Ligand binder design. Structure first.
Ligand code: HEM
Length: 293
């Protein structure tokens, strides 16, 4: 019925092996700091880990991070994936240095690394994704649109098994990076510290004086006087009563947010995967800084 995707550890690799993949990504983040006006690749890597996992469909178990399908042209050229080719090119040299790691493992680990190196919470990670054939490649149109409301959001997230708390936690990733007119038809940074992971998203949502305006792509976006932007979908988080109390909580307790994000991020990344009982426990990578590197 529903595919079964069983996690299979890359033959003979242990934690120390993954730790080295992480340090390599981390060191390259540190070094290629000029990308996107000095934002770095942090933000784009997180978005890549989310896009490759976001095609999951809890109904027939297709999509999700398992198969590393993003590697195939059909998924690669998904209009909703515009701009991700940048994170991809960043990871190639790494892949070339550690060719035994599957695609799905590499892509998702990049997401984890970026978060943790951007001072976010530690995200437990599990290895075992296995590259699947080009034909397991999900059709385009599974990633969400930005021009909708709270109802759309709720509904969408339901396909990935996420509840309200999880949706709002995960959305605080929008404190990172920015929108790029040529990629999405939206333009502008989401906040001020755009490569440091904090509860900024929530605070901005509550505290700014937002103006609905149309952009040069002729789409509507919420614009703040401080020069930030919010998508309709971000904004809807304060339109929905259920969502808004969660926003409030997060605005109030970065710690709770960090706890919730961590869980929800991991869940997103592990959707559709079966972990045999003998599978190693989730790894918790040290940062460069914890290693004194
Ligand atoms: C309704 C759900 C979502 C929608 C509609 C959405 C849409 C977008 C759009 C349109 C962009 C701008 C891309 C560009 O023009 O370069 C963006 C950026 C971004 N998204 Fe989301 N997103 C959603 C949820 C998420 C989630 C769940 C995460 C991670 C948990 C995430 C992480 C990011 C990051 C970090 C960026 C900034 C990327 C950069 O600076 O290149 N987003 N998102």
């Amino acid at each position: 019925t529903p595919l079964v995707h069983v996690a299979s550890v890359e033959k003979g690799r242990s934690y120390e092996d993954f730790q080295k993949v992480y340090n390599a990504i981390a060191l390259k983040l540190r070094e290629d700091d000029e990308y996107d006006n000095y934002i770095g690749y942090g933000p784009v890597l997180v978005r890549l880990a989310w896009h490759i996992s976001g095609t999951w469909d809890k109904h027939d178990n297709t999509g999700g991070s398992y198969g590393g399908t993003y590697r195939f042209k059909k998924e690669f050229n998904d209009p909703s994936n515009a701009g991700l080719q940048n994170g991809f090119k960043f990871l190639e040299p790494i892949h070339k240095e550690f060719p035994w790691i599957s695609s799905g493992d590499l892509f998702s680990l990049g997401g984890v690394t970026a978060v943790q190196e951007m001072q976010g919470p530690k995200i437990p990670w599990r290895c075992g994704r296995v590259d699947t054939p080009e034909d397991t490649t999900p059709d385009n149109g599974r990633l969400p649109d930005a021009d909708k409301d709270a109802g759309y959001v709720r509904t969408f997230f339901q396909r990935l098994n996420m509840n309200d708390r999880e949706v709002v936690a995960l959305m605080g990733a929008h404190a990172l990076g920015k929108t790029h007119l040529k990629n999405s038809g939206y333009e502008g940074p989401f906040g001020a510290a755009n490569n440091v992971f904090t509860n900024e998203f929530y605070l901005n949502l509550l505290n700014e004086d937002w103006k609905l305006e149309k952009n040069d792509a002729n789409n509507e976006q919420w614009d703040s006087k401080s020069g930030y932007m919010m998508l309709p979908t971000d904004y809807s988080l304060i339109q929905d009563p259920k969502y808004l109390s969660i926003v409030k909580e997060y605005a109030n307790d970065q710690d709770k947010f960090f706890k919730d994000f961590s869980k929800a991020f991991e869940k997103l990344l592990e959707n559709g995967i079966t972990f045999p009982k003998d599978a190693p426990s989730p790894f918790i990578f040290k940062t460069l800084e914890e290693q004194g590197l």
